[PDB]
Design a protein around this ligand. Structure first.
Ligand code: HEM
Ligand code: HEM
Ligand SMILES: CNCCCc1cc(F)cc(CCc2cc(C)cc(N)n2)c1
Ligand SMILES: CNCCCc1cc(F)cc(CCc2cc(C)cc(N)n2)c1
Ligand SMILES: C[C@H](O)[C@H](O)[C@H]1CNc2nc(N)[nH]c(=O)c2N1
Ligand SMILES: C[C@H](O)[C@H](O)[C@H]1CNc2nc(N)[nH]c(=O)c2N1
Ligand SMILES: [Zn+2]
Lengths: 413, 408
């Protein structure tokens, strides 16, 4: 592989040089003959697999703190090595855990919000042993991150995988989601994306309100045991009613959303150690809600209804009635969050910040892995600066990875 | 292996076998994806390439290994042998050109691929000849508003020193002028080319929408200037169906999108001059041409006239202005009965096309970065469609700009 790869920005002519790609640790899915750049998704580590992975990570940590080759570096290497030999695994120091989490984010090629990577509150929950304990840790996470609307990015890290039969998992794909209910007539109530998970909760004992915006309970698995249900205290769930600055009728749509985006189904990989339960949260970019959650056809799908109230000609697509309603819906989402003083960022500000971040990373780090297909917002793409920005995509470690859904793998006791 | 692609909105899963045919590179490796990078012979090289192309041509007409097939292979052999090149049969030329279009990963318009008028211009020898052939192309393809896809193919490359080149990047473009006060009149993308035309003898009217002259290079010679007769150049004044002040912006655009800077490769032969044209998708003009910061850059003005609050980005004033502009463009072309497709209709057609190709062909190479429109991405069906990208031949390839390689 070449040492220096160049990316160009076509709007500004700015050319950047990437050397960091050389540290790439896993597969993209692409080959020389085929590109899988738009493919969404393209029993434990042995002693011998673990050694080099740990050393790689420890070396990187001590390099970051300007102590590479130091006595403490060599000592930590030797202590880690001894531990893998005696126990087949090892434990990260708090400093290393914190470093690894921040770097997993920094390395997340699909995230446009990475300018904030070094400000991340890490909660060490590796002493957790039960589902009730997971509940307590998650509630504290939610409260801290929510911060009455002045959101703060955070991650809570539960115990690493051991033999694979004692995994900690948050079964919820996200900490806060709204229920979806399939009706006998084929229609769906609530969020159609969440029908399967909702059914699981119901089966596990949940009493469903059967509303349009019912916050789902937490379904929590500790130490490989069967998962348990807990209801997040409603006062910990900050919500924003959606209204529009011009259209007084917009509030009559009965829309709202939750303030806190918190992914809970991913796996955090640090130095070959696997943290299967590591819920992390930041704050929303407007389009996430205004374009995808609200306007995807398989989601709340409100374009028609909004178009109707806007008195739009909806007979020809070439009227762009869909596009027109989309913009207004996204204005309403930003207006409502700002008015309730809940942190949110529009797609213009976020993408501009990301370009600045990316340039800084090329400068200090020799590159910045980025997935253009995900970085470019789902509306108004080319009027954001990321559209014109060539990106290189590659996988650095530590990283957040996908993992199978726990109800597909769980061995019920 | 076989490969699956999922549409996440419909949950439809298609299976790609066609990719096993590719041999050219994508640019990516197992460790680095370059999917968002815009730009990532001899007798012994020539025959296997010729062979494969002839092989797939005869296979496409259900006469593989036929007598005609054999003789053709034999024929191509002797010719590469004796002349260091070979000439395509007419049928092969048309097949090759349609398939270059069909294989263009970046084109959302491929549902039309087999409806392509092919003009054989391989007997051309001079820039005057090229001009004549290009004027006929434009006249035919424009067709008084009812646009028709067409391609004009000039003589292939031989020694690299006698190249035919259309120096314009597209047949019809507006000039751009670098003002004293540092701003730009017209189209800033064309500033450099406009200046080469001026230097070569072109007398610029210095307006905002001056149709550039043709600059044509035949057989490696110096390029010569020609003015396309204006009655061949169909234009549309942009107005809005509700905002009667929109026409006052004084905007127009041309009806014929016609790429003229690409290289058509067929069976190892290189056609360095192959202007091809279709019809516009509205966003091309409404979003990119007009609203790119480095293009006509009109968002700010439109935003003013719409009396929008422009102090905070979060008012989405830019997005609002963008939608209205694209409405105007569509409305204008339609009102003038000039062929145009909106990005909703175009992306639908493309999904249907994809399904057709998977069914009859075993796949369809597609570049999501180019296919997804530059506005309202996820409300179009291609946003939710996983695509595989790979390079099939015959193909359209990029080539160097001629002013960087030509000796006068
Ligand atoms: C602080 C403000 C943040 C903003 C504005 C932000 C923005 C975004 C957006 C818009 C996406 C695409 C989401 C989607 O389309 O589903 C995304 C994805 C992602 N973000 Fe960030 N994010 C933030 C914080 C974080 C944090 C704190 C982490 C981890 C510690 C993180 C890691 C990721 C990862 C791994 C993805 C890919 C998710 C997936 O593949 O499903 N982000 N982010
Ligand atoms: C008939 C209606 C057509 C439509 C609606 C259409 C639409 C488009 C659009 C929107 C693009 C993106 C262009 C850009 O952003 O610069 C594109 C690219 C492209 N099209 Fe089509 N097209 C059509 C016809 C054709 C024809 C007739 C050919 C060839 C014979 C062709 C070959 C290509 C190629 C090679 C590209 C990639 C160009 C590049 O990489 O710069 N298209 N098309
Ligand atoms: C195929 N994707 C399916 C999941 C989409 C999703 C749903 C959700 F409720 C919440 C999210 C959160 C995404 C996110 C995560 C973070 C940390 C910040 C931010 N602004 N956005 C995603
Ligand atoms: C980075 N790209 C730079 C060139 C952009 C461009 C300029 C132009 F005048 C005309 C086009 C036409 C593209 C096209 C070509 C065809 C054949 C059909 C269609 N609807 N659109 C593109
Ligand atoms: C098929 C395609 O890869 C898929 O629809 C992707 C496109 N880009 C995306 N980008 C973001 N931010 N989020 C998504 O869910 C998707 N979905
Ligand atoms: C950096 C990126 O590759 C570049 O801006 C691409 C993105 N997608 C595009 N898509 C189309 N249709 N046309 C373009 O010019 C571009 N530009
Ligand atoms: Zn790739």
């Amino acid at each position: 592989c070449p040492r220096f790869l160049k990316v160009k920005n076509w709007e500004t002519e700015v050319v950047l040089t990437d050397t960091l790609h050389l540290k790439s640790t896993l597969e993209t899915g692409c080959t020389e003959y085929i590109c899988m750049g738009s493919i969404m998704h393209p029993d434990v580590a042995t002693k011998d697999q673990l050694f080099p992975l740990a050393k790689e990570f420890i070396d990187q940590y001590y390099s970051s703190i300007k102590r590479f080759g130091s006595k403490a570096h060599m000592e930590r290497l030797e202590e880690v090595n001894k531990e893998i030999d005696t126990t087949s695994t090892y434990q990260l120091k708090d400093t290393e855990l914190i470093y690894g989490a921040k770097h997993a984010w920094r390395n997340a090629s699909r995230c446009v919000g990475r300018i904030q990577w070094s400000k991340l509150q890490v909660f060490d929950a590796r002493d957790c042993t039960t589902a009730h304990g997971m509940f307590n840790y998650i509630c504290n996470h939610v409260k801290y991150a929510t911060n009455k609307g002045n959101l703060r990015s955070a991650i809570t890290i539960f115990p690493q995988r051991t033999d694979g039969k004692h995994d900690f998992r948050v079964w919820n794909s996200q900490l806060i989601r709204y229920a979806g209910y399939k009706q006998p007539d084929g229609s769906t109530l609530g969020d159609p994306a969440n029908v399967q998970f909702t059914e699981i909760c119901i089966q596990q004992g949940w009493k469903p309100p059967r509303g349009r915006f019912d916050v789902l309970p937490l379904l929590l698995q500790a130490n490989g045991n069967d998962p348990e249900l807990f209801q997040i205290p409603p006062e910990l769930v900050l919500e924003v009613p959606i209204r529009h600055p011009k259209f007084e009728w917009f509030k009559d749509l009965g829309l709202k959303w939750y303030g806190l985006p918190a992914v809970s189904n991913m796996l955090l990989e640090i130095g070959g150690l696997e943290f299967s339960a590591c819920p992390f949260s930041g704050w929303y970019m407007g389009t996430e809600i205004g374009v995808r959650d609200y306007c995807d056809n398989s989601r709340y799908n409100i374009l028609e209804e909004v178009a109707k109230k806007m008195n739009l000609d909806m007979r020809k697509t070439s009227s762009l009635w869909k596009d027109q309603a989309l913009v207004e819906i996204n204005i309403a989402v930003l207006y409502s969050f700002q008015s309730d003083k809940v942190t949110i960022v529009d797609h213009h500000s976020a993408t501009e910040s990301f370009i600045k971040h990316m340039e800084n990373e090329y400068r200090c780090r020799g590159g910045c892995p980025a997935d253009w297909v995900w970085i470019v917002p789902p509306m108004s793409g080319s009027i954001t600066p990321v559209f014109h920005q060539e990106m290189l995509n590659y996988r650095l470690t530590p990283s957040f990875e996908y993992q199978p859904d726990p109800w597909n793998t769980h061995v019920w006791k």
